[PDB]
Each structure stands twice: as structure tokens, then as C-alpha cells.
Design a protein around this ligand. Structure first.
Ligand code: GDP
Length: 184
């Protein structure tokens, strides 16, 4: 199966991919891949990893938009060959970023992207990372579910809190990914 990973920069996506696969990606061995899509062999499956969305110092905002366009085009073009998507979010930061963006009338990246995947009928699991920094995870997940337009009945199927840093619930996230792939 093919699994795409996506998320804003610094949410812990490359760390999560390493916890899941034992393969270090985006650590510099390969320079010039910072703004590119990479493929990872995960036993007999394939992970296609999108460059992180959003701001990164040194990354001009025009290049930021270009990257986002490239990710959109790849996922639109390969949608029929994508079995499941994992959107990695930073559980501590995401709700507060969503609130400040809505205040100024902009659509938060996380919300925009999860809703985009839904328009494409791609089953999506949200890895709510950095659980070790989150004092009320249920509250965070309930907030994100309302902003992402996720039905109450589907919250526990969609939102999986983990700590890629310490390993918390990584096996549960792996089980979910494979369960979604099979159920598909
Ligand atoms: N506290 C905490 N920090 C994390 C976790 N996962 C990743 N990080 C930290 O978040 C930063 C970015 O992680 P990285 O995997 O390089 O992010 P990416 O840009 O989304 O690939 C780092 O300093 C990681 O140590 C986590 O679960 N908990």
C-alpha cells in the first residue's frame, strides 16, 4: 500500500517516520531535498513524504506556496493510488495557531489540508504529536475534530495522540494505519 505523510514544518513528522520505519529521513545526508517529496520503503509498503507545510526561517513565503502547490498537484494526481494519509499535527501548538489565524480571517493550514484530503476521498488519520507537552489531550482532539469537520462518532478513528519523541502510542498509530488500509 502507499501511505502519504504530511504536516506543518517542525510538528515532528520526520521523527515519527523514523519511529515507524527505523529510517532517518530529512536529516541532511541528502542535501537539496528540503523542498522535495521523498519516497521511503517501509517493509513492503511505501511512504511518500511531503515536505513540511508553512513557515520555516530561510524559506521565502513564495517558495512555501509553490511547495504547497506541488504537494496538492501530486496528491490530486496520485489520489487513486494513495491508500491512506497521515496528517501529523503538533497537539500543543495547533489549537492556538488555529485560533490566531481565524482571528485574522485566514484559513489555518491544518484545517485547509485535512479538508482538502476529504474532498479527495482519501482516508486520513491525524497523528496528534507531542502528547508529552499536552495537559488536556481530549480537549485538544475535541477542538481539532470540530475545526476539521470530523463527526463525533469518528473522532477516535481519526485522531491518534502519540509522542514520536518518547514512543507513546506509536504502535497504536501503526495498527490504525494498517487497519485503515485493510478496511479500505
Ligand atoms: N516534546 C516533543 N518534541 C518532539 C516530538 N516529536 C518531535 N519533537 C521535536 O520537534 C522538533 C521537530 O521534529 P522534526 O521531526 O524534525 O519535525 P518535522 O519538521 O515535522 O520533520 C524537534 O526538535 C523534535 O525533537 C514529541 O513527540 N514531543
Amino acid at each position: 500500500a502507499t501511505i502519504i505523510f504530511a504536516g506543518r514544518s517542525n510538528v515532528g513528522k520526520s521523527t515519527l517516520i523514523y519511529r515507524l520505519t527505523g529510517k532517518k529521513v530529512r536529516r541532511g545526508k541528502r542535501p537539496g531535498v528540503t523542498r522535495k517529496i521523498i519516497e521511503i520503503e517501509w517493509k513492503n509498503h511505501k511512504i511518500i513524504d511531503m515536505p513540511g507545510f508553512g513557515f520555516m526561517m530561510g524559506l521565502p513565503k513564495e517558495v512555501q506556496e509553490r511547495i504547497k502547490d506541488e504537494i496538492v498537484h501530486f496528491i490530486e494526481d496520485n489520489a487513486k493510488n494513495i491508500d491512506v494519509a497521515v496528517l501529523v499535527v503538533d497537539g500543543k501548538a495547533a489549537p492556538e495557531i488555529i485560533k490566531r489565524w481565524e482571528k485574522r480571517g485566514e484559513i489555518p493550514i491544518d484545517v485547509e489540508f485535512y479538508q482538502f484530503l476529504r474532498e479527495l476521498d482519501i482516508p486520513t488519520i491525524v497523528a496528534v504529536n507531542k502528547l508529552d507537552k499536552i495537559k488536556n489531550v481530549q480537549e485538544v482532539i475535541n477542538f481539532l475534530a470540530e475545526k476539521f469537520e470530523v463527526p463525533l462518532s469518528e473522532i477516535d478513528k481519526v485522531f491518534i495522540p502519540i509522542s514520536a519523541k518518547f514512543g507513546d502510542n506509536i504502535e497504536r498509530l501503526k495498527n490504525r494505519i494498517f487497519e485503515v488500509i485493510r478496511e479500505r
